[PDB]
Design a protein around this ligand. Structure first.
Ligand SMILES: Nc1ncnc2c1ncn2[C@@H]1O[C@H](COP(=O)(O)OP(=O)(O)OP(O)(O)=S)[C@@H](O)[C@H]1O
Ligand SMILES: [Mg+2]
Ligand SMILES: [Zn+2]
Ligand SMILES: [Zn+2]
Lengths: 124, 121, 396, 111, 105
């Protein structure tokens, strides 16, 4: 029994391939092989084109008050600041825009084959 | 990006994750998608660690401990990193060139995957 | 008729008339080995010529008046025919008190002021109250402010509404100018030369050479070097009171690295004590005090208060007291509070031109108001209701 | 630049995590308050009193270089800041960054 | 060498902190009424009994304590085994052992 070889290298070498997130684009928008076994043809072709969110619907849901509580089953301003509120509402608008853009981005791609086709073509 | 000052999952399963990130320019409270909690737990993120979170993907990287806690022990095997200087929320508009071969090789083999076949691959 | 404004601090008494200027006078008696039987009182310290080995007789212990005889003697000297010639029976006095003042001290203050001197009317407030009143007079659009009073014997942080003090959020730091001076004495005695009997000279040294570092560890690394690159290190010539009346710092061009000088001056070399001593205000745990510093205490006090008011408090941080005169104090406070303050809330820290006399100016302003007569307590009302109504009216 | 702690172990204490470690040279002795990661590293590599070890502070890399009561105990300061210089070939960088655990290919071909 | 228990270290720290509040280090040159503790014990001031003096004492800091050398003040990686004092170099250790370790000279 021998001790292993301890190979010492510069700490900078281990970060050679690393790229900061602010310096790289999202490669998940071209991920076709990741959709196989997870995304179905129904989702890509029939559901998402009909039930995609819109900016109007998102804004309406965000601005509207909380829904009433679900019924139980039955067996049958001195300290107000204008600048702070303007900043907060701008932040809320930006958050809603980000939610919309991300929801559109995460369902844009359709599978090459899809779960239904693969299941049909897969013999026991 | 910033030092983690609070990490509180909100139970209804987990409805959302409330995180507190600190920078030199202030503190920001963020509501996280519950899927990011798995990434936070895998990375072993605790209070006082300097992390960044990608808004579009939810990726979390714990890039060391804050140097304000460097004296909490006399001998720990930790990498202590300065507190980030800018704002917690950083926006940059970038233009990156990729080639068709990059997308081909990116779609030739799967990435990640918690299955046994993926791990052995 | 006239109104007397007094800031009975543990170190300096800011005493003056409402219609006149302000004078800074030490509020303690002195004894020296150059005088066999002679106790100096208040500003009489100017008369002595060899303040080395000076003995201090203080009326305050841990920032509260505990010794009544020396304070009485100092007041009699200040109110006597030599200083101000106060007509007690027809004069109103505005005198400051420490925060959270004990009941017994308040009873003794009221009794002495209303019986031993028989003042026409007395108004007891806290220095922070006067500072807040002055700040609100200066800034009429602001509804709230937070006052940081880093003084001789402690450092309080008090938030003030427009006309009320949030007693629930008052935070006290047990670090003051006295503690810093004693720590500097101890450090110098342990390291270079014994100066434990030179409180006056070491206090002047602290006032002259110390500063607050923006980057603590960069300054430590710079000080650890030897040669030209050690810009932090300076040479101080202590006053011998024979040919050097007051201490001074040698010019950098005249500095000698070896440390030996042909002139027989007793030279005290300070490199890391320049910023280690002021840092105790921001990090009490450096010396062993398990208490939060000024910025963390400010943020904690503000965050204890309701959420709606918080942006108003963060926008109006005011620094008062002697310790605020350190170079770099304001920048360090602003940086730390900005680091801890939520990003959506703006942070503004204001350092007045004379933080020593801020409370005195506030008292002068509050004397000139038309609501002054309702605040004070008269002797005629003192006779019957005084002992209860002093507690009732004064928001100590 | 790295911080390297080289000395002789005097006493190692681990309690249910907190721990203390006492190290000595011929000129100075010190007790350290240990963190969780360094405690785990010292548990993984069996360290007992009398062993002469060197620790890389940032990584916990502990290598036992003998026992003293055989290598003589270190003389000077226990904690030393050292400048380490590495010359890494472009091939080495490529192989290390080619895949996870890719540095193994520098020794077994398989690039 | 000898080892000092927690009580001795706490007493030494308390004594140094109280000594930092001393008005003067020497005695009266003339060589021939209460104190704060007397006022506290007379006030009978109880915790959680409203806003008062004791409740206003600042709490422990969140940031951990930073060690400094007991001799020269520069940062100190080392802790003395005997007394728990911090130090940074062999020279500083020798000075501490000669001056303030064990017996307080
Ligand atoms: N330029 C300066 N730099 C640093 N410290 C200073 C300076 N000038 C005065 N001091 C310190 O200021 C302190 C006295 O400040 P004051 O607030 O006036 O004290 P005081 O208010 O009379 O006593 P308290 O704390 O209110 S009971 C002393 O400890 C001095 O060392
Ligand atoms: Mg004062
Ligand atoms: Zn040292
Ligand atoms: Zn010791």
């Amino acid at each position: 029994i021998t001790p292993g070889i301890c190979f010492s290298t510069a700490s900078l070498v281990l970060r050679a391939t690393d790229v900061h997130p602010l310096q790289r684009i999202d490669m998940g928008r071209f991920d076709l092989i990741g959709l196989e076994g997870r995304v179905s043809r129904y989702e890509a072709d029939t559901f998402l084109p009909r039930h995609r969110l819109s900016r109007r619907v998102l804004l309406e849901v965000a601005t509207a008050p909380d829904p009433p509580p679900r019924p139980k089953p039955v067996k049958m301003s001195p300290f107000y600041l204008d600048s702070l509120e303007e900043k907060r509402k701008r932040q809320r608008s930006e958050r809603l825009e980000r939610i919309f853009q991300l929801s559109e981005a995460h369902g844009a791609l359709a599978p090459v084959y899809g779960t239904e086709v693969l299941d049909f073509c897969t013999l026991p | 990006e910033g030092e983690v000052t609070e990490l509180t999952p909100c139970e209804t399963t987990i409805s959302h994750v409330i995180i507190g990130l600190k920078t030199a320019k202030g503190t920001k409270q963020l509501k996280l998608d519950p899927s990011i909690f798995e990434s936070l737990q895998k990375e072993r993120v605790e209070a006082g660690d300097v992390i960044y979170i990608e808004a579009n993907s939810g990726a979390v990287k714990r890039q060391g401990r804050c140097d304000t806690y460097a004296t909490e022990f006399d001998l720990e095997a930790e990498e202590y990193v300065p507190l980030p200087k800018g704002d917690v929320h950083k926006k940059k508009e970038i233009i990156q060139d990729v080639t068709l071969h990059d997308l081909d090789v990116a779609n030739a083999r799967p990435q990640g995957g918690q299955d046994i076949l993926s791990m052995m691959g | 008729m006239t109104t007397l404004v007094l800031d009975n601090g543990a170190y300096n008494a800011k005493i003056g008339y409402s219609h006149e200027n302000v004078s800074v006078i030490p509020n303690c008696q002195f004894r020296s080995k150059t005088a066999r039987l002679k106790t100096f009182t208040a500003n009489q310290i100017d008369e002595i010529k060899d303040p080395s080995g000076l003995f201090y007789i203080l009326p305050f212990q841990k920032g509260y008046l505990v010794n009544w005889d020396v304070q009485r003697q100092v007041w009699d000297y200040l109110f006597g025919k030599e200083m101000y010639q106060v007509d007690f029976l027809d004069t109103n006095i505005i005198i400051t008190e420490p925060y959270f003042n004990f009941t017994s001290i308040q009873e003794s203050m009221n009794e002495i002021l209303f019986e031993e001197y028989q003042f026409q009317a007395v108004l007891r407030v806290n220095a922070g109250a006067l500072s807040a009143h002055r700040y609100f007079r200066d800034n009429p659009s602001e509804l709230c402010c937070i006052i940081v009073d880093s003084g001789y014997s402690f450092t309080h942080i008090v938030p003030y509404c427009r006309s009320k003090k949030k007693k629930e959020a008052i935070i006290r730091i047990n670090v003051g100018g006295k503690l810093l001076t004693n720590h500097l004495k101890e450090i110098i005695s342990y390291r270079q030369l014994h100066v434990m009997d030179e409180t006056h000279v070491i206090n002047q040294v602290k006032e002259d050479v110390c500063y607050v570092s923006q980057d603590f560890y960069r300054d430590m690394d710079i000080a650890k070097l030897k040669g030209e690159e050690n810009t932090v290190m300076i040479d101080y010539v202590l006053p011998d009171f024979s040919t050097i009346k007051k201490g001074f710092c040698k010019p950098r061009e005249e500095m000698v690295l070896s440390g030996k000088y042909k002139s027989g001056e007793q030279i005290l070399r300070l490199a890391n004590e320049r910023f280690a001593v002021p840092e105790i205000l921001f990090n009490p745990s450096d010396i062993g005090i398990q208490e939060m510093g000024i910025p963390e205490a400010i943020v904690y006090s503000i965050q204890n208060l309701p959420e709606e008011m918080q942006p108003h408090f963060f926008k109006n941080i005011v620094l008062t007291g002697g310790n605020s005169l350190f170079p770099g104090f304001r920048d360090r406070v602003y940086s730390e509070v900005r680091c801890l303050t939520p990003t959506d809330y703006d942070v503004s820290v204001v350092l007045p031109e004379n933080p020593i006399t801020y409370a005195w100016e506030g008292g002068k302003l509050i004397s000139e108001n038309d609501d002054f007569e309702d605040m004070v307590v008269t002797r005629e009302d003192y006779e019957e209701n005084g002992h209860s109504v002093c507690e009732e009216k004064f928001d100590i | 630049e790295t911080e390297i702690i080289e000395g002789e172990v005097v006493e190692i204490q681990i309690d249910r995590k907190v721990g203390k470690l006492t190290l000595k040279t011929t000129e100075m002795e010190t007790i350290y308050d240990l963190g969780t990661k360094m405690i785990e590293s010292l548990t993984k590599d069996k360290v007992q009193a009398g062993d002469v070890i060197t620790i890389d502070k940032a990584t916990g890399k502990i290598s036992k270089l003998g026992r003293s009561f055989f290598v003589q105990c270190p003389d000077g300061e226990l904690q030393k800041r050292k400048e380490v210089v590495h010359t890494v070939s472009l091939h080495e960088i490529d192989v290390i960054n080619s895949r996870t655990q890719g540095f193994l290919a520098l020794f077994s071909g398989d690039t | 060498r000898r080892v000092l228990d927690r009580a001795a270290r706490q007493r030494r720290i308390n004594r140094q902190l109280e000594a930092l509040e001393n008005d003067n280090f020497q005695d009266d040159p003339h060589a021939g009424r209460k104190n704060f503790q007397a006022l506290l014990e007379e006030q009978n001031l109880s915790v959680a009994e409203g806003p008062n003096y004791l409740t206003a004492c600042a709490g422990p800091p969140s940031r951990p304590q930073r060690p400094f050398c007991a001799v020269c003040g520069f940062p100190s990686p080392y802790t003395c085994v005997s007394c728990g004092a911090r130090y940074c170099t062999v020279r500083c250790l020798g000075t501490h052992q000669e001056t303030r370790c064990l017996k307080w000279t």
